[PDB]
Write a protein that binds this ligand. Structure first.
Ligand SMILES: O=C(O)CNC(=O)C(=O)O
Ligand SMILES: [Mg+2]
Ligand code: NI
Ligand SMILES: [Zn+2]
Length: 331
C-alpha cells in the first residue's frame, strides 16, 4: 500500500505531464497521494495562469463576510456577518490597514502560533465564494474554468444525464480569514490555485480517519451535534492542532504559496487560514473513484447547510432514499 502513514505529498509535474489533468490525478493516486486527504502540485516553470494581476481591482465583492468567533482559542465557531459591497481594490486596502494587516513575525511557524493564540479576538473580513475565474482563456493546462464537469463524469460512469453546471469560485482573503473543518459537498474533490499574495496554511485529516474527527467534533460542539447529525456541513467549527494532538486525531499540515495548487480528496476533512491579502480560485471535481464516496456522503437536512442547485441531482441519483428528507432541508 502506497503512502501508509498518509503524509501530504508534493508533486512537480513536467510540462508534458501537465497536459492531461485526469491522467495526472490518477498518477498521484497511484502513488498514494489521496491517503493524506490533500496534495500539493507545483506547476512546471514554463506555465502561467495569466500574464499579470495588474487589472483585478475592479472585481466586486458583493457580500464581504466578517468572521466573528465564539468559544475558546483552540475550540471555537465562527459566524458570518454580511458587510456592504466593496471592490477588490477597496478590500486590498482594508486588508493592508493597521487594524487588519499581518503582524510582524519570524517565519510561518511563529505566524501559526500567533493565529491560534489570537484569532478569536479579531473579526477578519473574507470575500468568499465569488463566481468567476482569473485563468486566461488561452491557458490550456490546469485551467480551473475548463475542467470536465461533475455532471459529465456522472454521466460517463453511470449513464444518467442530469441538469446542473459546475463553475469556479474566487476567494479574496486577509490575515486570520479562516476556513472551518469540512469535507466538500457530496465528498467531492476540490482543487485550489493560489493566484496571488500571501500564503494559506492548511490542516487535513486522512479520509480513512474522518470519523475520528467527527466523533471529537460531536464531543466539542455538543449542542450543534444534537441539532444536526452532519453539522460539520455547516462549515462553522474550528479545532486547533494542539487540541487535535491532545485527543489523538491523526492530521497533517502544509502551507500553500502563490503559484501552487492544492487538491483535496474525497472525504478529506480540511481547515485553514490565510496569512495576509491573497486571492485563490477553487472548484469541485470528480473522478471515477469519487462515485462510491458520493453514494455514502453524509448530509445536512436541518436546513443550515443550504447549497447549490447542482447538488440536487447528485443526491437524487446517488442517494434516492435520502432525497425527500434532504430536499425538505433545502426548502
Ligand atoms: O480557500 C478557502 O477559503 C477554502 N477552500 C477550500 O476549502 C477548498 O479549496 O476546498
Ligand atoms: Mg478589475
Ligand atoms: Ni474545501
Ligand atoms: Zn445541519
Amino acid at each position: 500500500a502506497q503512502n501508509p502513514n498518509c503524509n501530504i505529498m508534493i508533486f512537480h509535474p513536467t510540462k508534458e505531464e501537465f497536459n492531461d489533468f485526469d491522467k495526472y490525478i490518477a498518477y498521484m493516486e497511484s502513488q498514494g497521494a489521496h491517503r493524506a486527504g490533500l496534495a500539493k502540485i507545483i506547476p512546471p516553470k514554463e506555465w502561467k495562469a495569466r500574464e499579470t494581476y495588474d487589472n483585478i481591482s475592479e472585481i466586486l465583492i458583493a457580500t464581504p463576510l466578517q468572521q466573528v468567533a465564539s468559544g475558546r482559542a483552540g475550540v471555537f465557531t465562527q459566524y458570518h456577518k454580511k458587510k456592504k459591497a466593496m471592490t477588490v481594490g477597496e478590500y486590498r486596502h482594508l486588508a493592508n490597514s493597521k487594524k487588519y494587516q499581518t503582524p510582524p513575525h519570524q517565519n510561518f511557524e511563529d505566524l501559526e502560533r500567533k493565529y491560534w493564540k489570537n484569532r478569536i479576538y479579531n473579526s477578519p473580513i473574507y470575500g468568499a465564494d465569488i463566481s468567476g475565474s482569473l485563468f486566461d482563456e488561452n491557458t490550456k493546462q490546469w485551467n480551473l474554468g475548463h475542467l470536465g464537469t461533475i455532471q459529465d463524469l456522472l454521466e460517463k460512469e453511470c449513464g444518467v444525464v442530469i441538469e446542473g453546471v459546475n463553475t469556479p469560485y474566487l476567494y479574496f482573503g486577509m490575515w486570520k480569514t479562516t476556513f472551518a473543518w469540512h469535507t466538500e459537498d457530496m465528498d467531492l474533490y476540490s482543487i485550489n490555485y493560489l493566484h496571488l499574495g500571501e500564503p494559506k496554511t492548511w490542516y487535513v485529516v486522512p479520509p480513512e480517519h474522518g470519523q475520528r474527527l467527527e466523533r471529537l467534533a460531536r464531543e466539542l460542539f455538543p449542542g450543534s451535534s444534537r441539532g444536526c447529525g452532519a453539522f460539520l456541513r455547516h462549515k462553522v467549527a474550528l479545532i486547533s492542532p494542539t487540541v487535535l494532538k491532545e485527543n489523538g486525531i491523526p492530521f497533517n499540515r502544509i502551507t500553500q504559496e502563490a503559484g501552487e495548487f492544492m487538491v483535496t480528496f474525497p472525504y478529506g476533512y480540511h481547515a485553514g487560514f490565510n496569512h495576509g491579502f491573497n486571492c485563490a480560485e477553487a472548484i469541485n471535481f470528480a473522478t471515477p473513484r469519487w462515485i462510491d464516496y458520493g453514494k455514502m456522503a453524509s448530509q445536512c437536512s436541518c436546513g443550515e447547510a443550504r447549497v447549490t442547485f447542482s447538488m440536487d441531482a447528485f443526491v437524487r441519483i446517488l442517494q434516492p432514499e435520502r432525497y425527500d428528507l434532504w430536499k425538505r432541508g433545502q426548502d
